[PDB]
């Protein structure tokens, strides 16, 4: 027993406990189970948690697993009384909680699935800095009666508001900033939505689907890649903050949208002024003109030109934006670090090392997997190159050849062979032309001889008829004469 169980009323805290000692630790509270209302395990080197070991505490209402080194699945579905679960700062990958969860703190994990058994209360879900890739990564229950949903710094591509319909009446805060979102879609009336944050994503079109957030007070599409705004959008008088800086708008749509949301234009101005200090955004190029408060431009066809530029990289004969890109990736890593800070807990030096031992065992293990995938890819290439040199004839190599050198020799040889083959074919086609000309010469001579024959055939017939007229005169005379 190097571990300590502090009690304060009906809140218990366990310290200096480890994976091999935690089950003991919990058993020594079974006597007192009725009274364990909050249990706090934070700041230890725990890496697994036995839902079943905790099921005796049937009054357990808050469980704080924050800043341990939990990995893989964390399954607490079975804790049906559980209401607040804090597992900020771990490495969990899938997470399942039970029918009573009201607040779920899970920032700074490796989370990419979450299940929430069916239930009647609202839920506040906090998932900043994980690996969610799409809303359906949260199960149906996880998306019912959500009131606050923080998915900042995840890995989502596309939002489909329909998938949050079971929170039409509850959802008040939706944070999706710093993902990778390039399409949003779905019509749903979010009766309660106060704020929507799509800052730093990759959206190109604010479309009809944003009537879903017509009620908000606060909305950001800051730092996306917007060009067009759907004009049919009708925002409430409720709106106060409306940030669109860092896009690339075609003035056409600024004018068309302000025209029937006149209000929003002064709201736009007031937002940039609150945020930056002047009443218009600082366009990337001064030459560039605003409409109201946002930089804009009469653009021939912005979507087509973006698609053409992609298709050029795809199809270019050879294998700027590496500055737009690299500073976009630093922007992200500054937010992650910042956030890793905003959620940092206090931890003693001896448990840091206890923690770094388990964490380093996982890095080493992942690196072994990677170094060995590497080794496999390498032998596969060597194998393929050895099948290849067995099917053609390479020049003699004096020095040992690398795989780069082998691929160059192999393509080179096929190119020689192709050219040889083509040269052979040319000769054959030229031969056919020479013999065909010869055929026409011969077939001319064929008609010349056929016509001469036709004409001898005639001349024999003449000379015959003439021999016959003489034959008649001979037999007429001989009659007359003897």
């Amino acid at each position: 027993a190097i571990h300590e169980i502090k009690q304060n009323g009906n809140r218990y805290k366990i310290e200096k406990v480890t994976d091999s000692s935690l089950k003991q630790a919990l058993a020594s509270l079974r006597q007192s189970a009725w009274n364990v209302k909050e249990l706090d395990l934070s700041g230890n080197p725990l890496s697994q948690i036995s839902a079943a070991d905790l099921a005796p505490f049937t009054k357990l209402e808050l469980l704080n697993l924050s800043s341990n080194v939990l990995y893989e699945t964390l399954d607490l579905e079975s804790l049906s009384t559980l209401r607040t679960l804090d597992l900020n700062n771990n490495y969990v990958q899938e997470l399942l909680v039970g029918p009573s969860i009201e607040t779920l703190h899970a920032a700074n994990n490796n989370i990419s699935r979450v299940s929430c058994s069916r239930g009647q209360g609202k839920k506040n879900i906090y998932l900043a800095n994980n690996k969610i890739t799409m809303l359906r990564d949260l199960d149906e229950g996880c998306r019912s009666r959500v009131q606050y949903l923080d998915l900042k710094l995840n890995e989502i591509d596309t939002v489909n508001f329909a998938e949050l319909a079971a929170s039409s009446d509850t959802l008040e805060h939706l944070n999706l900033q710093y993902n990778f979102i390039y399409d949003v879609k779905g019509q749903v009336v979010f009766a309660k939505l106060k704020t929507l944050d799509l800052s730093s994503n990759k959206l190109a079109f604010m479309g009809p689907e944003f009537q879903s957030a017509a009620g908000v007070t606060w909305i950001s599409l800051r730092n996306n890649k917007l060009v067009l705004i759907e004009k049919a959008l009708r925002f409430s008088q409720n709106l106060e903050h409306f940030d669109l800086r860092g896009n690339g708008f075609h003035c056409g749509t600024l004018r068309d949208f302000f025209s029937k949301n006149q209000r929003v234009q002064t709201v736009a101005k007031q937002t940039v002024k609150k945020l930056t200090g002047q009443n218009e955004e600082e366009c990337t190029v001064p030459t560039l003109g605003h409409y109201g408060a946002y930089c804009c431009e009469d653009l021939p066809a912005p979507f087509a030109d973006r698609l053409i530029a992609l298709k050029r990289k795809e199809h270019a004969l050879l294998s700027t934006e590496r500055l737009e890109c690299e500073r976009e990736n630093q922007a992200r890593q500054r937010e992650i670090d910042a956030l890793k800070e905003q959620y940092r807990t206090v931890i003693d030096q001896v448990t840091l090392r206890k923690q770094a031992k388990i964490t380093l065992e996982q890095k080493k293990k992942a690196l072994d997997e990677q170094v060995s995938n590497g080794r496999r890819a390498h032998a596969e290439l060597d194998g393929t190159l050895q099948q290849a040199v067995g099917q053609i004839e390479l020049q003699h190599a004096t020095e040992e050849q690398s795989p780069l050198q082998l691929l160059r020799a192999i393509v080179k040889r096929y190119e020689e062979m192709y050219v040889e083959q083509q040269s052979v074919q040319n000769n054959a086609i030229r031969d056919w032309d020479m013999y065909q000309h010869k055929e026409t010469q011969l077939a001319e001579e064929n008609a010349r001889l056929k016509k001469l024959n036709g004409e001898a055939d005639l001349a024999l017939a003449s000379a015959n008829a003439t021999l016959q007229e003489l034959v008649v005169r001979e037999q007429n005379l001989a009659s007359q004469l003897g």
Partner: protein, 534 residues
Amino acid sequence: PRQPEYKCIDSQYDCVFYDVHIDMQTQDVYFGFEDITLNNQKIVTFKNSTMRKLPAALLDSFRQVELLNLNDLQIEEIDTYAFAYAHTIQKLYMGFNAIRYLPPHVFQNVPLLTVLVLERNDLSSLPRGIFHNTPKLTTLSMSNNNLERIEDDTFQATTSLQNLQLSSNRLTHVDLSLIPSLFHANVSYNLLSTLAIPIAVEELDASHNSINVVRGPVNVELTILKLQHNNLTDTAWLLNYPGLVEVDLSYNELEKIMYHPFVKMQRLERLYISNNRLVALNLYGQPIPTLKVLDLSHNHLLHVERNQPQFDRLENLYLDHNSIVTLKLSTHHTLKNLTLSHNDWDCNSLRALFRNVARPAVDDADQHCKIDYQLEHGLCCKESDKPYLDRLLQYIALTSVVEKVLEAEVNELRAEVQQLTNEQIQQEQLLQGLHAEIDTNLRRYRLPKDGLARSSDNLNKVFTHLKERQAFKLRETQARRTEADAKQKETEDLEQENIALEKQLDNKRAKQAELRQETSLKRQKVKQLEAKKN
């Protein structure tokens, strides 16, 4: 003695040597009469003959030949002096033999040479000075040899050379710009990578090379330029050829076309650009007013609609095999031929288009459509309010699938992890230059790259492509050869059937003589019967 002696036989040619056969052992031969001066036939050829070596004896005894036709006589060697007495030869035909080399001064004495065909031999090089003495040379063919270079002095004295055929050798250098008299030339199917174009040539075919650079003086006469099947990557050079009527840039490596290199073309009618890598086209800034046929098919065109002012003016417009989303034609357009199949059409754009052009002007059609597309007017199209946004999203969704892809124990582990991190970096570096090259070869052969597939699969994509390509080329050649053999067969049968028609002509003359004898013999009998009747 004069043991083996061959004599003429007037027929086109005024001298036709028959059944002559010389080989490599043959020592002494005699042509015509001994009195060289009776041999003054000017237009000589051979029939049923094969001369492994062309004997000095021939133009030793015949010094009055104008046109010498030695086509297809299995000649393998030319006697070092066969042409010493050939002062009068104007036209020399030696195609389709097996000549491996020309002796250095073999044409030092045929100074009235105007036409020379050496096509389809085994020449590997020309001797320095080979033509320094045939200033009158106007037509020269050496198509189908194994030549690697035509040195620059080769044609310094042939300042009338108008028609040059070098097609289908192994040429890596030949500077046509040094022969300013050229009127027609064909250096197709060689290994060229730069093409110098002389000042006044009017038709030039340099297709099937690897040309990436064109140079030479502005040339206003150049009318037909064939460059299909090359390594071209820009077109600015075109500015220098204001007189083109047709140019073929097919099967090159072009990525865009702009109007700038065409602004000086006063009469261009025909511009072929199929099978490049076009991702953009702007010919509307300044249209080419005279153009009639424009082939852009099999590229990667996406947005072409602003080219309306050029397209309206064409007769023949081939957009097939691209990703074109919209196209727009005036009611007054002049197209008679239009291809549209295999793109990525917007249904609204197709419907408005088919108000102004209909089949049979539209010459092609789709068969089956992907999941969200359906036929309008015979071509696949998807309904969409914003087609370009849609195509931009479609594309991004395909690529993002790929973009989603004792504390002594603690000190020993930090070490272990650093040593592994280094092995893993080294593994990437070591195979780097290789992955670069695999991508270069997929781009080169226009293979599509599966950013999922494991590396040995991309490497196999290249090899499978090359092997298929070899096989298909080989089968194709076999077919061509089967065709040549068959056609030689036909000519052998034809000549047999001509011999039989000639034997028949021979019999009929004999019958005519007989009948003519029988006629006089009766004319006689009837004269006798008349005297005996006083």
